[PDB]
Amino acid sequence: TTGERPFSDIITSVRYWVIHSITIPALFIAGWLFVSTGLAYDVFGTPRPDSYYAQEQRSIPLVTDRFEAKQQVETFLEQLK
Amino acid sequence: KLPEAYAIFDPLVDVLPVIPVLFLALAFVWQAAVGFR
Amino acid sequence: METITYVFIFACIIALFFFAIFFREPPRIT
Amino acid sequence: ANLWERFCNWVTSTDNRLYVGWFGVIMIPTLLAATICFVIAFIAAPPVDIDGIREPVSGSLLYGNNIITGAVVPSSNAIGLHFYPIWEAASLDEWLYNGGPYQLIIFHFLLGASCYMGRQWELSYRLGMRPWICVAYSAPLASAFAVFLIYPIGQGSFSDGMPLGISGTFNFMIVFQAEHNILMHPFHQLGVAGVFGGALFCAMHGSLVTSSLIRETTETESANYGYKFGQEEETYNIVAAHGYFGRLIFQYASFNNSRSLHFFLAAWPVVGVWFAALGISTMAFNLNGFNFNHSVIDAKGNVINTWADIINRANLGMEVMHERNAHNFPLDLA
Amino acid sequence: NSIFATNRDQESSGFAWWAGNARLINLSGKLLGAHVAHAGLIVFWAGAMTLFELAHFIPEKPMYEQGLILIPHIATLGWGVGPGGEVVDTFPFFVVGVVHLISSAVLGFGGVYHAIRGPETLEEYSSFFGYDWKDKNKMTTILGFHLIVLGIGALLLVAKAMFFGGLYDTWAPGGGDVRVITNPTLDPRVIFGYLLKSPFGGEGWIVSVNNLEDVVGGHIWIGLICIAGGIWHILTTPFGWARRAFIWSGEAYLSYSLGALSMMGFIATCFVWFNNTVYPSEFYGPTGPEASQAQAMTFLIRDQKLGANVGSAQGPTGLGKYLMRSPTGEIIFGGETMRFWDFRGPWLEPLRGPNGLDLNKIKNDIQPWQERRAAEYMTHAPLGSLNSVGGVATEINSVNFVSPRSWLATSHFVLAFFFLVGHLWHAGRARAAAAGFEKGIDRESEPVLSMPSLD
Amino acid sequence: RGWFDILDDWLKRDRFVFVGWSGILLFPCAYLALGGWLTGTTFVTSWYTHGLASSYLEGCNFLTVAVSTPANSMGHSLLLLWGPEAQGDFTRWCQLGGLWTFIALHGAFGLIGFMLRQFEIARLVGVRPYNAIAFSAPIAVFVSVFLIYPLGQSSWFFAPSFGVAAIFRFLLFFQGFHNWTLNPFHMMGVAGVLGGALLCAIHGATVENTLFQDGEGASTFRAFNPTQAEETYSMVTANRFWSQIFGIAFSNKRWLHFFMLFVPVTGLWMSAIGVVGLALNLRSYDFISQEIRAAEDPEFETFYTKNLLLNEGIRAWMAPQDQPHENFVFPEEVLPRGNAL
Amino acid sequence: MTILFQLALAALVILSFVMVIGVPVAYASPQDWDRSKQLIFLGSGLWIALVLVVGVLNFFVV
Amino acid sequence: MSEGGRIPLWIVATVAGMGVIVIVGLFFYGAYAGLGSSL
Amino acid sequence: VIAQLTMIAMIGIAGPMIIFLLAVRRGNL
Ligand code: CLA
Ligand code: CLA
Ligand code: CLA
Ligand code: CLA
Ligand code: CLA
Ligand SMILES: CC1=C(/C=C/C(C)=C/C=C/C(C)=C/C=C/C=C(C)/C=C/C=C(C)/C=C/C2=C(C)CCCC2(C)C)C(C)(C)CCC1
Ligand SMILES: CC1=C(/C=C/C(C)=C/C=C/C(C)=C/C=C/C=C(C)/C=C/C=C(C)/C=C/C2=C(C)CCCC2(C)C)C(C)(C)CCC1
Ligand SMILES: CC1=C(/C=C/C(C)=C/C=C/C(C)=C/C=C/C=C(C)/C=C/C=C(C)/C=C/C2=C(C)CCCC2(C)C)C(C)(C)CCC1
Ligand SMILES: CC1=C(/C=C/C(C)=C/C=C/C(C)=C/C=C/C=C(C)/C=C/C=C(C)/C=C/C2=C(C)CCCC2(C)C)C(C)(C)CCC1
Ligand code: OEX
Ligand SMILES: [Ca+2]
Ligand SMILES: [Ca+2]
Ligand SMILES: [Cl-]
Ligand SMILES: [Cl-]
Ligand SMILES: [Mg+2]
């Protein structure tokens, strides 16, 4: 034995499921809303389906300058009207 | 398509072929309920 | 001479198989 | 005890330096024929019209190859799956031009190796052992059947069987990727998990047993002298080994039962390689790897490439270049 | 009261839960249960899957465009189809599905009953239904019953073909159609002549059967052989040479059947891959060979329309671009499809003459329907991805297609292989158990220790 | 007495999850590398660095998601979050490929942490540290492939990207540009890996099929006891079997297990050396004698020249989309292609 | 007539679910085997009858 | 009550496994609809 | 697609329901 109480005693315990029948659905719904509200896009800078290209543009917004790469990305995003 | 009369059962039909798989899975529920003795 | 070399090395390897099997140090139980 | 009785006794004898056995009565001649023909062909065979387009490919050492480039070249696409023994040719020269050696060698080899598996069963029975070593061996054997027999059957020609040579093997792999996207096939992936995993567990078991050898030697001798062949006592501390491994991960990912441990050691690579073999054997009937070419599309309808599409570009390169003189029609349907 | 109180545990049986069905070896009643319930699962799947197929079936679309494997089987028997394999009536499909599904209820009932309610062993209950695996007489009797049952089945196929509507004949004069078979091939030279054919190219062993008369006659022969055989085994017991040749145990019998079924699975794989007679391409799609040939046909047709003289067109390699000779001289299609010249099909055969493809027929007699069919087959070649993206591995997403021949061939190769493994497993184990060392080496009597050193 | 000794005491307690001094390095870096990969493959794009979608959020699946390498223009920038490229902006940092160096570096130091764990636990339990030593091969592979190799090339861009399909692309690229299959160091690698798998299988099967009967059960697993003195299988019978089947056999158990360490470990080390070569494009690409003969003689053909044609196909057809920073435009007429295809 | 057919078939489906759950349970249950037995006979007869009824009614709507 | 065993482990396993099946199934549905579907 | 999920839920619960029911009334599991 390592000193802690066995997992099979915990996941069959009523207390455990009391706690986790709350905390697990809450976390799940939270991630759900992280996506469904669109926040994920803006946190990670991921294009929405309408945001890979400006309407008539057909060239990838490839970063080509190391030290003004930040500026170059901002410029590309600006070019999406 | 099924004959028109039977059409209301289309969803049931869509699920029926998967049931034999369930038996395999059931074998493990049962065994779990007797401690894999 | 390249061909002779390849065939030579291969032939030596087969010879080694022969010795390693038939002239191994015999396993002995203590 | 007549002659047949004595013969059977000698064939099945547990005292022969190499076990013969009934599977061995077939194995020995077929494997000798395959080997002899292979060595001679690899050294001296003239070039072979593999793709049936009168474009002979040189495989042997005397005709300009080294060890890495050499091969016994698959039989001609004009032959397809037709049986082409020596006596079907008008001459040995014809036979060589059309890749007869390949057929002789792979058929004798497959027979011989099947009998090799059988033989593992047989000797296990004569020695009073449990019988399943041969089942372990069925995995590499099934793989050989896949690349030498089944894939040619599915594609309709031994000209698409794996060549008997190093670069030829690579050729086979590349064209295979072009035509089946085998890297994106879950069975090949299971195969990789099988051999990566087998290598991992090999190193792991090796190092753990090595790490808990009981001290039986001095510093100036090999620790291996600490074990005597046939000794009754285990030579290492399996409790120590387990105690290390459980702490390294957590206590329960570890095997304290040596039997279960060794069973896992057998089962992981054997099952993974079974699936690799089934990968080649089902891609034989062109049920290919996952295809996600142009799977991601934006709101307008522009294709947004994924790494799957880059893989597709590479595959396209392979496809358009392979067997550059062999296709007259736009689709490579086999 | 106790969790070890029954015989359904390792403590009583000697077997772990993961080998739990091995606990049934000598429990004939419960084993009867297992078998009958499993038969239930098989019949269940037949019925349910047929109904699923039918519900998803657009009858004017090609079956093979629709992921169907059972309806092709029913249609091959002549039910529901007309000339060219058009669906004229789906109700037979429905009947087959429903009846299988209702039957599975009965099998399931008897299975569950025998498995958990009826006598756990049959021997005390009935000498007829009881059995000892070691009793060669009783075993051969049961083998006989089942042989008779199989013979009856083959004869059912024959009766369908001869007295109840016939079968779908892809080779029927004027185009594929349902035809009654009135002159089955009874000549043994032909029937067993098939059995002695090479499995290799242009021969193809029994997979080369290419007309319904041979099929039907073959099933007459197999039915009679099986009924006779069954009678034989009911009335006899294995001879000495047999007794000394085999291992006599349930596990051994099981291993033998696993070998048999493995072999049969591989055979089936090749049948559905190459044969377009009992797997009509109308229902299953073209074979690989067939589609390849069909591409050559398609472009021969296009270029000849444009003005090409396809007999004399030299390709880049020196071989003919469209037409060339096989290694024995027959005129065959050019390009890579040179490998597939053994192919035969009702759309191509009218172009065939004594020396192979006939240049004059090609120039003058190719009908529109032939062009249609060649184009269709060329564009439904059995190539496709695991996620059912049709075409070569580099094709873009657009077509949802994997040929039924690919699904059936691959599935049954996998199954046949693992059943070969199962054969080695249970054969080796049966030998070791009969000999008494399947649980390991006796420390006090280790055989190798009483053998002379190898060296 | 003495905070250091107290701390050492606590770190080395025998808890369910051993911590140790090594854990101070291992746990944060491993957690950050794994978390980085899950975060990236779930939420992050490769649009600005590769012109690729690469996350579940964009519609990729498990096979096609990846945390991709930075853009070629970034060179071998450490691309730290507070560095001169991202300048502390997390979003731009993700868009510029910062998660790639995040995961590669935290991963490196994590591997260091883990091997240190192997040493520390070996030392506390009292066994020889062979497990650590063997772990040197994963290290050599990671360091040569994910660090040395791109450091030799133009930038992190040509490093492997962290994803299933991305890694497949890495394989195909190495075939097309490096002819990596021809490299004797890769071959030694392959021999070590497949030979390792072989040893794993054959050893496992052999032990399981020369077991002594040590109980009455038909399931033989129960008939073992960790503290038993006796070998559970017959080395003598195993040796006879393999001697008669294969001609040779192990007879020394210690040598057997050391050899099981030696083969895959040595193999991975050799492959690492080959990759270090490839960092410099120091390839086993050609056989010069082959090329002189083929150049002069249009009828001379081998599997080696066939494979070079395949490679040329790969380079030409994949380079424009795989190397977007080069702005390759290859008109249809210059694409190498065989007849019809 | 169509809703009649749909009713007999729905009856067969219901009775079927009921058998599928209740028959193994009865079979493996300690108490009340005589009662359960009579009810399994009843369910079986009614099931067969309903299959035949749906079978017959089929040809008055299809 | 932290009492270990109040819920039968076989039921927990069954429910949990069914949950996994549901979620993976949802992902596979996702491969055929919306983003990633090729349509 | 509501009826499909509902049906596979009923059917899907039928098996574990049989196991549970028997386990409760201490039947011959
Ligand atoms: C085709 C699949 C299949 C079949 C037909 C069987 C059949 C059997 N198994 Mg095996 N088994 C299987 C797969 C199968 N098994 C798998 C996959 C495993 C690994 C998990 C096992 C592991 C295993 C072990 C360890 C044991 C068995 C045993 C048995 C036998 C007795 C079971 C029993 O009494 O439990 C009682 C179960 C119940 C009372 C629960 C209900 C059971 C019924 C049959 C369910 C019916 C459901 C169905 C929908 C109802 C339809 C009704 C309608 C038609 C009217 C029985 C013949 C036992 C044995 O050998 O007995 C001596 C045994 O000890 N099995
Ligand atoms: C002979 C067996 C067989 C074959 C050839 C087919 C073929 C087909 N089925 Mg069918 N079906 C089967 C059995 C079979 N099925 C079974 C058992 C079920 C119940 C689950 C179904 C229920 C079913 C439905 C509901 C549907 C199909 C559909 C289809 C079509 C598309 C298949 C697909 O996309 O799969 C995708 C590929 C996979 C899922 C890969 C499976 C990989 C397996 C798990 C590997 C297993 C190998 C081996 C057994 C493992 C051994 C383990 C080892 C350790 C020992 C295709 C024609 C579809 C269709 O188009 O209908 C019109 C469809 O909707 N099938
Ligand atoms: C599949 C093979 C099979 C075998 C070998 C048995 C054998 C037995 N059953 Mg079981 N049983 C089965 C399937 C089988 N059953 C099925 C499918 C069901 C569901 C209907 C049952 C339901 C059942 C019950 C409720 C009982 C038995 C009983 C028995 C025992 C006495 C039977 C007897 O003598 O009847 C005498 C035989 C006849 C009166 C003639 C039978 C004619 C049959 C019904 C028609 C044959 C036509 C054709 C060949 C069928 C082909 C089916 C195929 C297409 C699938 C005997 C051990 C009894 C028992 O175990 O008591 C302790 C018992 O009470 N069986
Ligand atoms: C499932 C079907 C089945 C099974 C399991 C059996 C089983 C048996 N039969 Mg029976 N038999 C059957 C059907 C079956 N039979 C039928 C339908 C008939 C009527 C033709 C017979 C007529 C029959 C007779 C006359 C005899 C048997 C005998 C036996 C016993 C020994 C057989 C043996 O040694 O085979 C092993 C096979 C051999 C030893 C011969 C070797 C043949 C070569 C080596 C195999 C070549 C196969 C080839 C690779 C693949 C096929 C293609 C090929 C044709 C080109 C065994 C119990 C014997 C017995 O004991 O009777 C009491 C016996 O004398 N059977
Ligand atoms: C111990 C675990 C550990 C280790 C080894 C690392 C290592 C790293 N991290 Mg990670 N990280 C960690 C935990 C760790 N991290 C944790 C817990 C978090 C969440 C808070 C992060 C979140 C994180 C982010 C967001 C980033 C990193 C990054 C990095 C990389 C650059 C770090 C750097 O430049 O530090 C520089 C600072 C130090 C090394 C501190 C040294 C302090 C010195 C020793 C004090 C000297 C005192 C002196 C002797 C006194 C003399 C007195 C005299 C003056 C009189 C590096 C590989 C960057 C990266 O990966 O870029 C791609 C990055 O962007 N980390
Ligand atoms: C022994 C055993 C086992 C097994 C079992 C089994 C396998 C069973 C089977 C069973 C079965 C196999 C069953 C079946 C049933 C069926 C049914 C119940 C059906 C019904 C039907 C119906 C109801 C129909 C309907 C309809 C119509 C008529 C028309 C159309 C539409 C519809 C579809 C609706 C297990 C594994 C669990 C384990 C333990 C032991
Ligand atoms: C239906 C049909 C037909 C016909 C068919 C037939 C007529 C068949 C027959 C078949 C047969 C007639 C078969 C047989 C087989 C056999 C076998 C398969 C055998 C085996 C054997 C074995 C396995 C053995 C073994 C051994 C040895 C070798 C040694 C000793 C020991 C032992 C015994 C183990 C045709 C094609 C026309 C057409 C189509 C349909
Ligand atoms: C990056 C970064 C960071 C970090 C973060 C983290 C740490 C995260 C974590 C994260 C995580 C930690 C996540 C997780 C995830 C998970 C998942 C997503 C899972 C999934 C799963 C699944 C899907 C499953 C599957 C499977 C398998 C695997 C086998 C069995 C069967 C099945 C199918 C169930 C910081 C803040 C420092 C800073 C900034 C940067
Ligand atoms: C035809 C028909 C019918 C029939 C039905 C049936 C026949 C059913 C059955 C069903 C069944 C037969 C079900 C079953 C199910 C099962 C399940 C749902 C299971 C699951 C499982 C799991 C989830 C597992 C888990 C686990 C354990 C327990 C332990 C180990 C680990 C694991 C996780 C694996 C009806 C009546 C509807 C009517 C209409 C028609
Ligand atoms: O021969 Mn060898 O490789 Ca199987 O695809 Mn077709 O053919 Mn050829 O091309 Mn791609
Ligand atoms: Ca008991
Ligand atoms: Ca008899
Ligand atoms: Cl090529
Ligand atoms: Cl072509
Ligand atoms: Mg989606």
D98's CB contacts (< 8 A; 6+ apart) are D48, D49, D75, D76, D78, D79, D84, D89
Residue F216, CB-side half-sphere exposure with 13 Å CA sphere: 5
E16's CB contacts (< 8 A; 6+ apart) are E10, F217, F219, F221
Q: Which domain holds residue A61?
A: 1-81
- Describe chain G by its helix, strand, coil percentages, rounded to 5: 90, 0, 10
Question: What DSSP string describes F159-177?
Answer: SPPEEHHHHHHHHHHIIII
DSSP code, position D76: P
The 3-state DSSP class for residue F149 equals helix
The 3-state DSSP class for residue E325 equals strand
- Rounded Cα distance between D305 and D292, Å, is 10
Kindly report the number of other CB atoms within 10 A of residue I1's CB atom.
8
- Rounded Cα distance between F220 and F225, Å, is 12
Which of D298, D303, D310 to mutate to probe the A interface, most A CBs <10 Å?
Answer: D298
Structure tokens belonging to residue I28: 């011959």
Say if residue E318 is exposed, middle or buried (CB neighbours under 10 Å; 0-12, 13-18, 19+): exposed
Kindly report the number of other CB atoms within 10 A of residue F143's CB atom.
17
DSSP code, position E279: T
Pairing of strands E167-169, E177-179: antiparallel
Residue type, F53: A
Residue type, F94: C
**Phi, psi dihedral angles at D316 (to 5 degrees):** -65, -45
Query: Would you say the C-alpha torsion A58, A64, A67, A68 has a positive or negative sign?
Result: negative
Helix (H) or strand (E) holding E331: strand E331-333
Q: Which three-class secondary structure string do you get for F5-74?
A: HHHHHHHCCCCCCCCHHHHHHHHHHHHHHHHHHHHHHHHCCEHHHHCECCCHHHCCCCCCCEECCCCHHH
Residue type, F181: T
E-assigned strand segments in E130-235: 167-169, 177-179
Token pair 């198989």: residue: C17
CATH 1.10.10.670 fits E286-381, yes or no: yes
Let me know: does E335 contact D330? Beta carbons within 8 Å: no
- Pick the ligand that lies closest to the CA of residue E12: 11
Which residues of chain H are within 8 Å of residue F58 when distances are taken between CB atoms?
35
Partnered with residue D71 across adjacent β-strands are D165
Helix (H) or strand (E) holding E287: none
User: How many folded domains does chain A comprise?
Assistant: 1
Residue nearest to atom 10 of ligand 8 (CA): F35
The 3-state DSSP class for residue E314 equals strand
> Minimal CA–CA distance to G23: which of G9, G13, G37?
G37
User: How many folded domains does chain F comprise?
Assistant: 1
> Minimal CA–CA distance to F97: which of F52, F58, F139, F62?
F52
Kindly report the number of other CB atoms within 10 A of residue A55's CB atom.
8
F219's CB contacts (< 8 A; 6+ apart) are E10, E14, E15, E16, E18, E19
DSSP code, position A26: H
- Rounded Cα distance between D258 and D132, Å, is 17
- Rounded Cα distance between A13 and H12, Å, is 11
Which residues of chain H are within 8 Å of residue I19 when distances are taken between CB atoms?
10
Let me know: does D21 contact D12? Beta carbons within 8 Å: yes
Kindly report the number of other CB atoms within 10 A of residue G12's CB atom.
18
Let me know: does F254 contact D224? Beta carbons within 8 Å: yes
First to last CA, chain F: 79
Q: Which domain holds residue F144?
A: 1-341
CA distance E330 to chain D (A): 12
Helix (H) or strand (E) holding E332: strand E331-333
The 3-state DSSP class for residue E446 equals coil
Helix F184-209 with F253-279: angle, nearest 10 deg: 160
Let me know: does F131 contact D207? Beta carbons within 8 Å: yes
Q: What are the b/e assignments for E99-125, b being 16+ CB within 10 Å?
A: ebbbbbbebbbbbbbbbbbbbbebeee
Token pair 């997403």: residue: E397
Which of A1, A35, A44, A65 to mutate to probe the F interface, most F CBs <10 Å?
Answer: A44
Let me know: does F43 contact F57? Beta carbons within 8 Å: yes
- Rounded Cα distance between F324 and A59, Å, is 10
- Rounded Cα distance between D68 and D168, Å, is 9
Structure tokens belonging to residue F50: 């590769």
> Minimal CA–CA distance to F184: which of F262, F313, F287?
F287
Helix G2-28 with G33-57: angle, nearest 10 deg: 160
| Per-residue CA distances from H24 to A65, D6, E102, F62, H10 (Å) | 41, 64, 32, 11, 21
Q: Is B26 in the pocket of ligand 6 (CB under 6 A)?
A: yes
E93's CB contacts (< 8 A; 6+ apart) are E50, E53, E54, E57, E71, E74, E75, E79, E80
Interface of E with C (CB under 8 A): 453-455
- Rounded Cα distance between D290 and E395, Å, is 11
DSSP code, position E155: H
Angle at E105 between CA E101 and CA E106, to 5 degrees: 120
> Minimal CA–CA distance to F77: which of F108, F100, F107?
F100
Helices (H), F86-126: 90-95, 98-125
- Rounded Cα distance between C9 and C2, Å, is 11
Structure tokens belonging to residue F160: 């492997």
E197: left (phi over 0), alpha (psi -120 to 50) or beta: beta
| Per-residue CA distances from E425 to D126, E68, E419, E420, E432 (Å) | 17, 34, 10, 9, 11
- Rounded Cα distance between F212 and D149, Å, is 39
Angle at I16 between CA I13 and CA I19, to 5 degrees: 145
F220 lies within 8 A of chain E by CB: yes
Architecture of the domain spanning G1-62: Orthogonal Bundle (1.10)
Which residue in chain E has the smallest CA separation from H36? E397
Residue G59, CB-side half-sphere exposure with 13 Å CA sphere: 5
DSSP code, position F211: B
Residue F339, CB-side half-sphere exposure with 13 Å CA sphere: 14
- Rounded Cα distance between F116 and F118, Å, is 5
- Rounded Cα distance between E40 and E73, Å, is 20
Helix E212-235 with E188-195: angle, nearest 10 deg: 80
CA distance E388 to chain H (A): 11
Q: Which three-class secondary structure string do you get for D213-243?
A: ECCCCCCCCCHHHHCCCCCCECCECHHHHHH
Residue type, F154: S
- Rounded Cα distance between E343 and E289, Å, is 6
Residue type, F49: T
Residue E149, CB-side half-sphere exposure with 13 Å CA sphere: 6
Domain locations along chain G: 1-62
Task: Using CA atoms of E373, E377, E380, E382 in order, give the dihedral in degrees to the nearest 10.
Answer: 160
Resolution attained, angstroms: 2.2
Q: Is F264 in the pocket of ligand 8 (CB under 6 A)?
A: no
- Rounded Cα distance between E62 and E380, Å, is 10
Pairing of strands E331-333, F66-67: unpaired
Q: Is F11 in the pocket of ligand 5 (CB under 6 A)?
A: no
Query: Would you say the C-alpha torsion H21, H26, H32, H37 has a positive or negative sign?
Result: negative
Let me know: does D126 contact D22? Beta carbons within 8 Å: no
> Minimal CA–CA distance to D223: which of D239, D232, D231, D235?
D235
**Phi, psi dihedral angles at F70 (to 5 degrees):** -65, 170
Instruction: List binding-site positions of A for heme.
Output: 20
- Rounded Cα distance between F107 and F101, Å, is 9
Kindly report the number of other CB atoms within 10 A of residue E89's CB atom.
12
Instruction: List binding-site positions of F for pheophytin a.
Output: 118, 131
Helix E404-435 with E250-274: angle, nearest 10 deg: 160
CB contact under 8 A, D298 and A2: no
Residue nearest to atom 47 of ligand 4 (CA): E195
I: neighbours with 3+ CB pairs under 8 Å? B, G, H
Question: What DSSP string describes F212-251?
Answer: B--SS-SSGGGS--TT-SB-SB-HHHHHHHHHHHHS----
DSSP code, position E449: G
